[PDB]
Design a protein around this ligand. Structure first.
Ligand SMILES: N#CC1(c2cccc(C(=O)Nc3cc(Oc4ccc5nc(NC(=O)C6CC6)sc5n4)ccc3F)c2Cl)CC1
Length: 301
């Protein structure tokens, strides 16, 4: 994957650099130990003379030169990856000396999908209630994330933290993959469990990642299976009531899997099980998931 050697990638300022004085910073959207994302109004960032709400990632008190380097590498990878409907897209950056490094991307009106789905439990019907979610919505979100991941894989990039908290919902039921990264407080966040000298999203991780620290596109497929469970539980937390310890990891390696969530179809639950194959090479590819979910979306209609 090209996303592990980011320091050699180009930053073309003539294309991406956006003047600080055209960016009006607003309220924080998320804050971690070293990073934060701020809502902003950017004047003319993507369309001449047009104000646009954007999301700006930058560092905060506690960050060091190390995090500054990391954020520059993030900027470089976003440029390399390029645009897709189902990934949050880069709009510009402020990199000039005298102010903080700022990475400016599309703002997504409804925010993270897990929180959103959990807000709609009382506003769901399998089939049609104007603003209700339906099975069609849930399969559609699943299909979109698969399309985004197929795209990322095509760019030789791996996500490493795929989960509903890293999927954002925009207008018109469009969902976008993101990575909040440093803007998430992984100490306070119960989704990230202490494992040695790191805080890791253990409930989303493939066995080979947990045990061998191996990250590949096919470990992303495992995480995609967990995301499917999150979608079809309407934003529930994975492995309900289970202590995430050494016994959890062993049983997982042994072949223990989550039961079907409340809103799933049989085919969608089988798709989760397929993503959770013990053998990485035997999991579906994102291209295959795109095909399959597209078929399920049609079967739903
Ligand atoms: N391409 C790519 C990938 C990649 C790698 C690394 C970083 C990113 C990335 O997402 N960067 C990034 C993220 C950011 O976080 C965002 C982006 C949009 C956004 N919209 C929000 N909406 C709300 O909160 C509404 C309820 C009120 S919050 C919000 N936060 C900001 C800046 C980034 F560069 C991304 Cl997309 C591999 C997936």
């Amino acid at each position: 994957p090209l996303d592990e050697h980011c320091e050699r990638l180009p930053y073309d300022a003539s294309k991406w650099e956006f003047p600080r004085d055209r960016l009006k910073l607003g309220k924080p959207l998320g804050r971690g130990a070293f990073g934060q994302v701020i809502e902003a109004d950017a004047f003319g960032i993507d369309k001449t003379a047009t104000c646009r709400t954007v999301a700006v990632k930058m560092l905060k008190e506690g960050a060091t030169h190390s995090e500054h380097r990391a954020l520059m590498s993030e900027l470089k990878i976003l440029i390399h990856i390029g645009h897709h409907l189902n990934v949050v897209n880069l709009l510009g950056a402020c990199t000039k000396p005298g102010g903080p490094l700022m990475v400016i991307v599309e703002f997504c009106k409804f925010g993270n999908l897990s929180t959103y789905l959990r807000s709609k439990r009382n506003e769901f019907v399998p089939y049609k209630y104007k603003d209700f979610l339906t099975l069609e919505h849930l399969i559609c979100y699943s299909f979109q994330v698969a399309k985004g991941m197929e795209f990322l894989a095509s760019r030789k990039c791996i996500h490493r933290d795929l989960a509903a908290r890293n999927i954002l919902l925009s207008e018109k039921n469009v969902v976008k993959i993101c990575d909040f990264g440093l803007a998430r407080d992984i100490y306070k966040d119960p989704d990230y469990v202490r494992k040695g000298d790191a805080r890791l999203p253990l409930k989303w991780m493939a066995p080979e990642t947990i045990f061998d620290r191996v990250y590949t596109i096919q470990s992303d497929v495992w995480s995609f299976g967990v995301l499917l469970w999150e979608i079809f539980s309407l934003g529930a937390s994975p492995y309900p009531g289970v202590k995430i310890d050494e016994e959890f990891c062993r049983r997982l390696k042994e072949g223990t899997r989550m039961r079907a969530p409340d809103y799933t179809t049989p085919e969608m639950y089988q798709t989760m099980l397929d993503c959770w194959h013990g053998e990485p090479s035997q999991r579906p590819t994102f291209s295959e998931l795109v095909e399959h979910l597209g078929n399920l979306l049609q079967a739903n209609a």
